[PDB]
């Protein structure tokens, strides 16, 4: 019954993952929220269909997305089986292991045991032969980096992942990971990190610069900073200081013909080293509003120095 829009590649822009021939849509769709046990199945399908119809080819999951850890993967597995499997070779599907998935010493952090056992569970829940990208979800300083990276390499060499990625790494540790995956001859093309007007962590921990200097992509998540970079906290007449930052940023957005959310998405994409911005949605209208932003990623030196002075604590 679902037939992907014939116009789905007409507007979206696609960007190389650093030096790689792998291209992400400039807007990627994440299943962190609204795909869990309590989610409505018809709404989840419509969100996926809306995403793909607008040229979003990348669906981002993790083992523990729900809630109930694994529910998002199982739900996406059902959407694939029922309607999207037809288009599987047009989709990039990711999953991850590295945060808490199940109880006990093998269900969190980083070991080869957890990472590989988790990937098998993810493939079973999603009904896939492989994921396009398999990520180490966060750094584990208590496991040798060589062990976690060799686990990603085993995933790729076992035909269970096309490419390796890492998430939440700093610049120094990303460099070490890149060196290990290079020596293992394991495709490694993408970093997934939190980035917004209100979260400059990757500008200060070396990740944004290390990714660019080593030809690795970046996919930015939480670009709307927990609803603070949306209309949610705006009036038409939650510290007083935060509401003021939001009021002034929204004025910069209005002058650009954008909502605050739209400008927040455009800002994360302003620099070429950021490959894609990862959005969420509860309703299709949010996808449709957000996909216009890929066409306004340019900012004047004035807009930028104002956004920085306003966002500065």
Q: Binding-site residues for NADPH, please?
A: 32, 60, 192, 224, 280, 282, 286, 289-290
Give residues 135-174 in contact with ligand NDP (rule: CB under 6 A).
167-168
Question: Site for ligand NDP (CB under 6 A): which residue of 52, 195, 221, 267?
Answer: 221
CA distance 15 to 22: 8
Q: Does 60 bind ligand NDP (CB under 6 A)?
A: yes
78, 41 Cβ separation under 8 angstroms = yes
Nearest distance from residue 59's CB to ligand NDP, in Å? 8
Give residues 78-137 in contact with ligand NDP (rule: CB under 6 A).
none
Pick between residue 183 and residue 203 the one whose CB is nearest to ligand NDP. 203
Helix (H) or strand (E) segment spanning residue 72 = helix 71-79
Helix (H) or strand (E) segment spanning residue 71 = helix 71-79
CA nearest to 168, candidates 147, 195, 137:
137
Question: Site for ligand NDP (CB under 6 A): which residue of 161, 224, 263, 294?
Answer: 224
State how far the alpha carbon of 267 is from the alpha carbons of 23, 193, 258, 277, 295, in Å. Answer: 20, 15, 12, 10, 12
Give residues 230-249 in contact with ligand NDP (rule: CB under 6 A).
230
Q: At what angle do helices 145-157 and 171-183 cross, to 10 degrees?
A: 50
CA nearest to 267, candidates 246, 294, 289:
294
188-217 mask for ligand NDP (x: CB under 6 A)?
----x-------------------------
Establish whether the linkage from the previous residue to 67 is cis, with ω within 30° of 0.
yes
- Scanning 30-38, 106-114, 120-128, 155-163 for contacts with ligand NDP by CB under 6 A, the matching segment is 30-38
Q: What is the DSSP pairing of strand 58-60 with strand 27-30? A: parallel
CB atoms within 10 A of CB 94: 26
Give residues 262-281 in contact with ligand NDP (rule: CB under 6 A).
278-281
Nearest distance from residue 73's CB to ligand NDP, in Å? 12
Pick between residue 150 and residue 278 the one whose CB is nearest to ligand NDP. 278
- Scanning 9-17, 123-131, 286-294, 302-310 for contacts with ligand NDP by CB under 6 A, the matching segment is 286-294
Q: Does 289 bind ligand NDP (CB under 6 A)?
A: yes
CA distance 211 to 175: 8
Q: Contact positions toward ligand NDP, by CB under 6 A?
A: 30-33, 60, 167-168, 192, 221-224, 227, 230, 261, 278-282, 286, 289-290
């Amino acid at each position: 019954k679902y037939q992907a829009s014939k116009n789905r590649y007409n507007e979206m822009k696609y960007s190389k993952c650093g030096e790689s021939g792998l291209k992400l849509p400039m807007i990627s769709f994440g299943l962190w929220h609204n795909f869990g046990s309590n989610a409505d199945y018809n709404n989840m399908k419509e969100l996926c269909f809306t995403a793909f119809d607008n040229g979003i080819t990348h669906f981002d999951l993790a083992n523990n997305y729900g809630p109930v850890p694994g529910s998002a993967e199982e739900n996406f597995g059902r959407i694939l089986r029922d309607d999207l499997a037809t288009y599987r070779d047009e989709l990039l599907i990711s999953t991850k292991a590295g945060y808490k998935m199940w109880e006990g010493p093998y269900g969190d952090f980083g070991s080869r045991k957890y990472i590989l056992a988790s990937l098998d569970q993810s493939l079973k829940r999603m009904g896939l032969e492989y994921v396009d990208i398999f990520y180490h979800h966060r750094m584990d300083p208590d496991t040798p980096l060589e062990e976690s990276m060799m686990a990603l390499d085993t995933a790729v060499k076992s035909g269970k992942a096309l490419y390796a990625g890492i998430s939440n790494y700093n610049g120094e540790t990303m460099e070490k990971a890149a060196a290990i995956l290079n020596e293992l001859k394991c495709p490694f093309v993408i970093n997934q990190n939190r980035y917004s007007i209100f979260d400059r962590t990757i500008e200060n921990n070396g990740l944004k610069r290390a990714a660019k200097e080593n030809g690795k992509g970046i996919i930015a998540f939480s670009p709307l900073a927990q609803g603070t970079l949306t209309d949610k906290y705006l009036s038409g007449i939650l510290t007083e200081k935060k509401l003021e930052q939001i009021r002034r940023l929204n004025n910069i957005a209005l002058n650009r013909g954008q909502t605050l959310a739209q400008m927040a998405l455009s800002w994360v994409l302003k620099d070429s080293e950021v490959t894609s911005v990862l959005i969420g949605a509860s309703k299709p209208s949010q996808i449709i509003e957000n996909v216009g932003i890929v066409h306004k990623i340019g900012f004047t030196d004035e807009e930028l120095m104002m956004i920085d002075e306003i966002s500065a604590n």
